[PDB]
């Protein structure tokens, strides 16, 4: 059996023009390419989560990674976020969301810039999600907090649009009424 592996090198960042394009909606049913992005994709985030493996392969944690980061611009992406949600999504969709707002108290981080952002960015607590799997099996998942926001920040990718663009330079931790810092 073969695959490929991604690299911290592989990896794209901020300056790159494929970061700013509206990345290509994937056909279906879906070719072996794009299975097997997905799986390297999903590969990477968990191994960059395993202390013994992310440290001999040198790889930077993260917890979601989109196609175009990787320079190519499809409509894939891939979240493995630690307890649970660890799948690859083909031409995600966000379909409805909540009124309630939220945010990482952290901050979101972003293995493409490599440059430190101060500021909240603020996201929906809760969105509606449909896609396809690997299998092509389409689904729709109410998601929250930090998984929502996750997903929002990846799907953000496959539309050009990077953390920062969210981000108020002069006021960048701006929050309204209500808002849930989640950290
Ligand atoms: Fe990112
Ligand atoms: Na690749």
């Given at each position: ?89 083909y031409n995600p969709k966000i379909l409805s969301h909540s009124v309630q ?50 997903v929002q920040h990846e799907i953000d990718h496959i539309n050009g649009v ?22």
């Amino acid at each position: 059996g073969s695959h490929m592996m991604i690299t911290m090198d592989d990896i794209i960042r901020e300056g790159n023009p494929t970061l700013r394009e509206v990345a290509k909606e994937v056909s279906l049913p879906l070719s072996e390419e794009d299975i097997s992005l997905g799986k390297e994709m999903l590969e990477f985030l968990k191994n960059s989560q395993d202390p013994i493996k992310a440290e001999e392969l040198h790889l930077r944690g993260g917890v979601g990674l989109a196609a175009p980061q990787l320079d190519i611009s499809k409509r894939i992406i891939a979240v493995h976020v630690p307890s649970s949600l660890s799948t690859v999504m083909y031409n995600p969709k966000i379909l409805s969301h909540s009124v309630q707002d939220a945010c990482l108290g952290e901050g979101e981080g972003c293995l493409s810039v490599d440059r430190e952002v101060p500021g909240y960015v603020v996201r929906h607590a809760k969105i509606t999600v449909s896609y396809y799997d690997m299998n092509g099996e389409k689904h729709k998942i109410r998601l929250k907090n930090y998984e929502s926001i996750v997903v929002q920040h990846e799907i953000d990718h496959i539309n050009g649009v990077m953390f920062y663009d969210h981000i108020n330079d002069q006021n960048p931790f701006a929050l309204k009424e209500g808002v849930l810092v989640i950290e």
